[PDB]
Amino acid sequence: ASMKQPVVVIGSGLAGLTTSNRLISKYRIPVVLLDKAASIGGNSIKASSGINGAHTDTQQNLKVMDTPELFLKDTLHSAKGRGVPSLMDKLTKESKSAIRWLQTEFDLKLDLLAQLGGHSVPRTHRSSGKLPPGFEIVQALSKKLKDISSKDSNLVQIMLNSEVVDIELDNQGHVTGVVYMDENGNRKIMKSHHVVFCSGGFGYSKEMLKEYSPNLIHLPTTNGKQTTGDGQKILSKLGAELIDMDQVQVHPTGFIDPNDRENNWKFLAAEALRGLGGILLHPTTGRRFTNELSTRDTVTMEIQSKCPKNDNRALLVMSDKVYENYTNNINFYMSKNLIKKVSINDLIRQYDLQTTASELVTELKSYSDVNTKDTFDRPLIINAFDKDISTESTVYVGEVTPVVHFTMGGVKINEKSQVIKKNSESVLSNGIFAAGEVSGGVHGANRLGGSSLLECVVFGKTAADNIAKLY
Ligand SMILES: Cc1cc2nc3c(=O)[nH]c(=O)nc-3n(C[C@H](O)[C@H](O)[C@H](O)COP(=O)(O)OP(=O)(O)OC[C@H]3O[C@@H](n4cnc5c(N)ncnc54)[C@H](O)[C@@H]3O)c2cc1C
Ligand SMILES: Cc1cc2nc3c(=O)[nH]c(=O)nc-3n(C[C@H](O)[C@H](O)[C@H](O)COP(=O)(O)O)c2cc1C
């Protein structure tokens, strides 16, 4: 393309980093990436379980059979009649290409799998090594932009500490600029004809929770303090449709920090910890109480009903075999006192359980016996406990509690990642796009683990491809 005014990308999470990379590298369209925070990455850079793909090279290598049709089936089942089915079709159909894009353009291995809740087969990809998938992916995409910037400053600029506050439109009805507050709190306008909102969810915002899901306002969150629904609000005021805003995902397993127990913010206990073999024990009885691998709305409901009203937490207990397949991650959690390695005898006392050690042993064994029926219907039992586990055998334990995690609602988009006008199927503006958690309609009533990083890549690429047709 001939260089004109920049495309403004709002937010440097995976949706924004995807959109920017695709614009600059495929089309040589100039980008200005604005983020109101002090650093790149949003909640994306903190993501720990991985990114979904159906029918990938990694699945083939590991002899997992998966299709876009099965992924779509799991996604429609998760959605429970909410959202836009054709966007779920797109999300799942283009996921093979998403994983391939990360592997071929950025040499991300993505060679390991985990099966998360609501998934029929393992399709959540992560790379072997020390780096969790959120950080590995953000790091690689940001490094590419920074390299490109250093060679051609006009092709991409990243501007941090820049909070977008509005979009300016001409008489009817085109984008002419982006209004933002710079590092010094001064109003600035970035002149532009194309803007992509990649500004994330609203899960941290107590006021938006009061408006859309009032019964969640006292729950802790995994979200960073930047997660305040800015783009949703800005776009709704400009006349965009919002959809499914009252669909807020509460993740069942945020870690409790033993030295800061009532912190409103929690580290997340990656769902892979359960997918790869971890179980949940009741915090008083020391006994399993539910299917740990169902969808997040269902596991959370079980914890909130079966664990004590006051003191609503559970014990996440992981075997040596879980540790061997998730070593670096668990080592990290241990470094933050979030997981402790303990003998079964000490587990009983350190967590004030009613069960005897010998009784807990009997339980772990029958859970691990996969020739014995599972009390709670768990669809996948791998890396369970040693058959001759004794009271002095060690396990890994963390304390977990439900947390506000993800907002499925947001601005309505179409298949081109264009923002849809309120009460209409026409676009609000030829130059307004959105991608990632700021958008609504992709997940419906519940998001499958692994599909939010996926959404970022699929719809970020889409926004870039479609701006390229118009630029
Ligand atoms: C602990 C945690 C763990 C997670 N683990 C996984 C996982 O394992 N697998 C998976 O698929 N997903 C996971 N997710 C969700 C996922 O990682 C992303 O958060 C999600 O995909 C949204 O990405 P995003 O690009 O839309 O938004 P974000 O990554 O949140 O980035 C949005 C950016 O927009 C900036 N911004 C916000 N408002 C403005 C404004 N007015 N002006 C300018 N900039 C603004 C923000 O500062 C932020 O940097 C996890 C999320 C969290 C919090
Ligand atoms: C396995 C693993 C899981 C992590 N989980 C979270 C998390 O849930 N929430 C979060 O904010 N950061 C998470 N992080 C990020 C760390 O808090 C930290 O930002 C990162 O390790 C960078 O190290 P630093 O503190 O020296 O900057 C995780 C990191 C790893 C390696």
DSSP letter string, 38-79: SSS-TTGGG--S-EE-SS-HHHHHTT----HHHHHHHHHHHH
In sequence order, which ranges of 219-343 are alpha helices (DSSP H)?
Answer: 230-237, 272-275, 296-306, 320-324, 327-335
| CA separation for the pair 19, 467 (Å, rounded) | 10
Q: 């709190």: which residue's tokens? A: 185
SS3 395: strand
SS3 316: strand
DSSP secondary structure code for residue 27 in this structure: I
Structure tokens at 430: 């030829």
11 CA from centroid of ligand 1 (Å) = 9
Q: 């080592």: which residue's tokens? A: 331
Strand partners, 419: 413
390 CA from centroid of ligand 1 (Å) = 43
**What letter represents residue 34's amino acid?**
L
For ligand 1, say whether the CB of 407 is within 6 Å of any of its atoms.
no
- To one decimal, the resolution in angstroms is 1.8
| CA separation for the pair 132, 129 (Å, rounded) | 8
What residue ranges in 95-185 does DSSP mark as E strands?
112-114, 124-126, 156-159, 163-169, 175-181
For atom 9 of ligand 2, the residue with the nearest CA is: 267
Structure tokens at 183: 């590092």
Q: Which of 199, 221, 276, 443 most suits a substitution to test ligand 1, by most atoms within 8 Å of the C-beta?
A: 199
Q: Which of 95, 161, 250, 453 most suits a substitution to test ligand 1, by most atoms within 8 Å of the C-beta?
A: 453
Which residues have a Cβ under 8 Å from the Cβ of 113 and sit 6 or more positions away?
50, 58, 59, 62, 64, 122, 123, 124, 125, 126
Strand partners, 394: 343
64-103: string of b/e by CB count within 10 Å (b at 16+)?
Answer: bebebebbbebbbebbeebbbeebbbbbbbbbbebbebbb
Q: Is 199 annotated as a binding residue?
A: no
For ligand 2, say whether the CB of 338 is within 6 Å of any of its atoms.
no
SS3 460: helix
What residue ranges in 73-132 does DSSP mark as E strands?
112-114, 124-126
Structure tokens at 231: 């783009």
| CA separation for the pair 302, 65 (Å, rounded) | 30
* C-alpha dist (Å) from residue 87 to 67, 93, 105, 415, 443: 17, 10, 25, 6, 9
**What letter represents residue 26's amino acid?**
K
CA angle 367, 371, 374 (to 5 degrees): 40
Say which ligand is closest to the CA of 47. 1
Say which ligand is closest to the CA of 41. 1
Structure tokens at 393: 């055998």
| CA separation for the pair 4, 471 (Å, rounded) | 8
| CA separation for the pair 17, 22 (Å, rounded) | 9
Structure tokens at 408: 């499925």
1 with 28: CB under 8 angstroms? Answer: yes
Q: Taking the mean position of all CA atoms in its chain, how far away is CA 223?
A: 10
Q: Please indicate the experimental technique that yielded this structure.
A: X-ray
Structure tokens at 165: 């506050």
Angle between helices 85-93 and 68-79 (to 10 degrees): 140
CA angle 59, 60, 64 (to 5 degrees): 55
**What letter represents residue 446's amino acid?**
N
Q: Is 17 annotated as a binding residue?
A: yes
44 CA from centroid of ligand 1 (Å) = 4
CB atoms within 10 A of CB 258: 12
For atom 11 of ligand 2, the residue with the nearest CA is: 46
Query: Cα-Cα-Cα-Cα dihedral of 353, 335, 44, 221, to 10°?
Result: 40
3 with 154: CB under 8 angstroms? Answer: yes
What is the Rg, in whole angstroms, of the alpha carbon atoms belonging to the chain?
Answer: 23
156 with 24: CB under 8 angstroms? Answer: yes
CA quadruple 205, 210, 213, 217: dihedral positive or negative?
positive
For ligand 2, say whether the CB of 79 is within 6 Å of any of its atoms.
no
**What letter represents residue 253's amino acid?**
T
| CA separation for the pair 258, 254 (Å, rounded) | 13
| CA separation for the pair 28, 26 (Å, rounded) | 6
118 CA from centroid of ligand 1 (Å) = 22
Q: Which phi-psi region, left, alpha or beta, contains residue 337 (left: φ > 0; alpha: ψ -120 to 50)?
A: left
Residue 245's H or E segment, with its range, is none
First to last CA, the chain: 8
Residues known to be catalytic: 251, 274
Q: Is 426 annotated as a binding residue?
A: no
CB atoms within 10 A of CB 353: 20
Q: Is 15 annotated as a binding residue?
A: yes
**What letter represents residue 147's amino acid?**
D
Q: Is 10 annotated as a binding residue?
A: yes
136 CA from centroid of ligand 2 (Å) = 12
Q: Which phi-psi region, left, alpha or beta, contains residue 138 (left: φ > 0; alpha: ψ -120 to 50)?
A: alpha
* Strand arrangement of the beta sheet that strand 175-181 belongs to: 163-169, 175-181, 187-191
For ligand 1, say whether the CB of 47 is within 6 Å of any of its atoms.
yes
Say which ligand is closest to the CA of 225. 1
Q: Taking the mean position of all CA atoms in its chain, how far away is CA 274?
A: 16
| CA separation for the pair 52, 156 (Å, rounded) | 29
CA angle 166, 171, 173 (to 5 degrees): 65
